[PDB]
Design a protein around this nucleic acid. Sequence first.
DNA 1: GCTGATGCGCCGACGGATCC
DNA 2: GGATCCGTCGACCGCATCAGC
Length: 267
Amino acid sequence: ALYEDPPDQKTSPSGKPATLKICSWNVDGLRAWIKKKGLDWVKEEAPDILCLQETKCSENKLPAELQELPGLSHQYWSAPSYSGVGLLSRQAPLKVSYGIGQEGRVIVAEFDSFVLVTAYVPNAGRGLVRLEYRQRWDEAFRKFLKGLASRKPLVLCGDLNVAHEEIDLRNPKGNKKNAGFTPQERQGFGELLQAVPLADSFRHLYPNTPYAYTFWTYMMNARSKNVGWRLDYFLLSHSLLPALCDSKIRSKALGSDHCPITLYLAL
DNA sequence: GCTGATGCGCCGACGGATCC
DNA sequence: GGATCCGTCGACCGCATCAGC
């Protein structure tokens, strides 16, 4: 069944208006993504912070368009020394660091009232050849997140490469041995929520909404049929839940095999 | 400099078996 | 014997290097 995201809810349930818009997007190659008009969509979406995964592009090779972004001028990039992530912000963060204590997968940015983590979580791979590394990575990531020195609440966003529950992908049955839906990956996601702790922003708001996905394989015209997976998330500290206005899946923005996702927070 | 082949990371379709 | 379950197989893209002109 096709899906259409509900309209933007820009006011918190108590009634306070959204003041921060965060967008996260696995762009499947930043240079290709830009040529496919990805930046045009970002300008229309006008977020305060933009998080990119799978940039596939070192900093010296960033297209010039990216320094034509006056509303997203504080830019931070991290590539492995493939992969690669980026963080663009209207305002300067107080602190930026890379890694989880050069894989080019995690950027941590401290702002006034929260800490933003963007992550491109390692894929378990075809035939699950990298699953044990992913499980070991998951545990190190959890420890890093909880061990964060600040008492500020956390926003974790990006491509976490796991469909948490069956409702999060079109074909749960045929995929329980595929990357992104092993019991090992699903369990790691549950542990992240419990350990840190964190809430799945989109699911806290739409706990029973099926067919909402953020990735479709390029093969077999899967996106036309909305045969997809929900791999990209905004995960929120419990104390940020009153500030949560909405969590969006921008199904119609093309340019990658992932679509953008957008968080509205009332801070 | 530029192209194209190649390699690498990144599952839905389909055919067959089992179940009531 | 339709529904379900299970294992098999071909394949979209972007980016790298390499070979040749």
